[PDB]
Design a protein around this nucleic acid. Structure first.
Lengths: 100, 84, 92, 104, 106, 92, 78, 99
DNA sequence: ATCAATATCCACCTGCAGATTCTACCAAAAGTGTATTTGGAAACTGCTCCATCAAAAGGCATGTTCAGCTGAATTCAGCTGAACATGCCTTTTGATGGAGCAGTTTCCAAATACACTTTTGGTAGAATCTGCAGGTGGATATTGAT
DNA sequence: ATCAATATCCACCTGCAGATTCTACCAAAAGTGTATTTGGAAACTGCTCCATCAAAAGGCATGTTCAGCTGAATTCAGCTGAACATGCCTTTTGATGGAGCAGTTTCCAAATACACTTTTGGTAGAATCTGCAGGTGGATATTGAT
């Protein structure tokens, strides 16, 4: 039975998703998270969200996560590893200044 | 059959792997998905806090895209494409 | 002919540490600090007034500027002190 | 009869008003805005001089020096975050040696 | 006598008058000089031209006739200076540069 | 009623550099964000320049120095060249 | 001699010691001179730009503070 | 004959210099470097430097180098090394945004 | 452990350079009163646009199994970098000369703001136009097994 | 290497959603005259900073030796990815009410402008405080050979 070696599909997916611009988190789970987080700050009074506000926040959020992955993976290769681990993300965050 | 009780779990494993693939990541530890959810939650908490502050200063109750753009600006990030 | 916040920094210093002095270099640091805090708050208040197409910077824009620029407890304290100062000023 | 007097502050309410009008922030400056600004400036000055004096005392010195201000900033979670991109001339750094580095 | 725009007399497409207004309106200074909006408008036009030349080139490389945000993103990040100038700028629906590090390759 | 933008001018410049090439509305939106961003950066720096030197006028000298502080390298050389040429040709 | 070489090994090691560095590779010193040169070039270009806008021929401390401000660094004490 | 193990003196120096605030590059080489760089940039016009301008520039450059060393050294420890190397500095710079 | 070697800690001390206090007289800001101008809140109001509820329907996520690949742990040899000594050389300190260059006042031309109407040019729908999305297939390229 | 399985590449197509073009009314740029400002020129201070020249003074460059660190090599258990099977969850047009948000008026509390008397904050000297550096010695502490 034909089956690809581990990493071949991974490389194909990297090429795939780097050629595209679509959002990669599903719209509804993300927006449900957003409105839940928002209800915390408001004391329970509820605000509406322009569709463009929700998609603006999702664009910013996805760009942020993708770029954090780029940096963290540089740190991964720097440890002479190939698998991203939480310490790579934590250390990238600390060096960017976000948790320095 | 397992059902969701935290919304951050709606950020599914395969969505996070797609993000990581866009970041060129080839192999992923299984501990990565909850680390990423934590990071995302903190990012969203800060940006939404600021955007809601911009909303409540305008005596509005609808967060607009410009509220979010201004919030991101105040976190050092400039978002293009929503000033229309 | 060259103004600073030194006199005021020293007044507050003597209120919170009466036996404590401050070297001229540390006073320079303090002056930079106050100009920085002022520039930040005023900038954010200016932008708030612009976004809402108002031409007046009021204490409301200041308070929002504080709530956006200071972290957590510092903002909580800072808004308390600003509200109390302005209320106590309103009473002539 | 100063505006600072009936505001209960040491920082000069009038001077803040002038720096707001003269600083190109908005065409009009309201009445309570310089009061609130001076109140914040005083509070911020207060907390920072309180911490820096405490450090001066921890080094059993009577005089605040830039080193004491640096320690004040970087030892306080929120100050340190607020002044994260700020350099304090002749302030030095926090003593910190990573655990992996000390012998045995 | 008939009127010619300040853009006409400066040789530009960007609105000199509107720029002058935006300078007066933004609380940058109590007074705005005569040449400042001319100069500002010229710089905006040049920047727009440069970014549209790079974005149009990306549009042709991907066999498109219409610039889309993706082409603007590729224009930015493939240009040393444009990338440095817009380093903290996110382009909605822009994606990333195709980039795989050498180690990852079979 | 009205919301004004730089759409018409961006389109004129686009047809000047790629005549058979068009632009989508989202691309046009990010172009408007970009033009507003460059303007705010330049005007902000020009405002600060004028303030440091206790002058109340923003002139082309301030715009030109603001460009030279904010733009990288060759973009700055071209931008001050084009602005200078505009002010010269405008005086007539 | 070369002017950048006046930034000597022991100085760079003292800087690394303040940065908590316990062991230093012998290649570090030339890298640090490269980095310091790049930093000083940018800061000095902008500071001189500010001076020369004021029609002065003495760059002040405030010119340098403004230069650092325009690359994201806030210097206190001048 | 008495001799310390490699690393003992280095730790002693880390403690010494993290306790101090003095400038660590000597003044005259640094200022000569700045004047060389400035004369190079002005392309032959020569400017004078307030004493405070040179000292401000040195305070900032030293704070910059010290913080670059802290960050790069985090990368060093991450590679399970103790010896800071150029690739640590290069990666730290790429990740902060400075390139 | 034992002890020797070396370093750092802590308590003193007292001047001297730096910090603090004080006297001053002065423009210079800050305060006050008054004579207006205005920006922005209140009060509707028409009207988008946001929330929600419908429940199919496909598009994805989830769970399990199994192959094979990685991160972690361990050893070890060569060599890089730390430690330590000396001696000279570059830096630091202090004064000195004086040139040039900031900083202050003071006119006035020139440049800007203001306020009055005149002309358009830019915006907003509505009416035309067309490039690309999403679906299909054939060819090429890549991969995995041997 | 071939040889088969599979995926990606790349071009076709057409209808429609989004783009471009088209038409008209008013906010707003332009014109003219006028009425404040300003930032600059000119002109004598005074700093301030550059150059210099010593000699005191510590710090840098050079050399030698060895500790122990890095980079290489090896193993393995568990983990991650690929592949496939179900079932749910996000997507997707529509509909409707209405909340809430622009758009307009109307003023009135609040801010601005001007011309007044006062209080304060900055500078230059100066007298007078003290805090702390730098130097000494002796008491614990740390490190390293054994």
């Amino acid at each position: 039975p034909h089956r690809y070696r581990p990493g071949t599909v991974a490389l194909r997916e990297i090429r795939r998703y780097q050629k595209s611009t679509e959002l990669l988190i599903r719209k509804l789970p993300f927006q449900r998270l957003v409105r839940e987080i928002c209800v915390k700050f408001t004391r329970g009074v509820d605000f509406n969200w322009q569709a463009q506000a929700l998609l603006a926040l999702q664009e910013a959020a996805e760009a942020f996560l993708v770029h954090l992955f780029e940096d963290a993976y540089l740190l991964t290769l720097h440890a002479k590893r190939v698998t991203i681990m939480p310490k790579d993300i934590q250390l990238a965050r600390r060096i960017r200044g976000e948790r320095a | 059959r397992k059902v969701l009780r935290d919304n951050i779990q709606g950020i599914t494993k395969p969505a996070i792997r797609r993000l990581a693939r866009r970041g060129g990541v080839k192999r992923i530890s299984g501990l990565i998905y909850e680390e990423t959810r934590g990071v995302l939650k903190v990012f969203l908490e800060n940006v939404i806090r600021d955007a809601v502050t911009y909303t409540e200063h305008a005596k509005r109750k609808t967060v607009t895209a410009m509220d979010v753009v201004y919030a991101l600006k105040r976190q050092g990030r400039t978002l293009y494409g929503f000033g229309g | 002919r060259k103004e600073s916040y030194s006199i005021y920094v020293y007044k507050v210093l003597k209120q919170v540490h009466p036996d404590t002095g401050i070297s001229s270099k540390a006073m320079g640091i303090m002056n930079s600090f106050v100009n920085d805090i002022f520039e930040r708050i005023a900038g954010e208040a200016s932008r708030l007034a612009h976004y809402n197409k108002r031409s007046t910077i009021t204490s409301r824009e200041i308070q929002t500027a504080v709530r956006l620029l200071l972290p957590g407890e510092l903002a909580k304290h800072a808004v308390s002190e600003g509200t109390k100062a302005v209320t106590k000023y309103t009473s002539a | 009869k100063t505006r600072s007097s009936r505001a209960g502050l040491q920082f000069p309410v009038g001077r803040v008003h002038r720096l707001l009008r003269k600083g190109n922030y908005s065409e009009r400056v309201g009445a309570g805005a310089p009061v609130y600004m001076a109140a914040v400036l005083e509070y911020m000055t207060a907390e920072i001089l309180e911490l820096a004096g405490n450090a001066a005392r921890d080094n059993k010195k009577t005089r605040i020096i830039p080193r004491h201000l640096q320690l004040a900033i970087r030892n306080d979670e929120e100050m340190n975050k607020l002044l994260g991109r700020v350099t304090i001339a002749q302030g030095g750094v926090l003593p910190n040696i990573q655990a992996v580095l000390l012998p045995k």
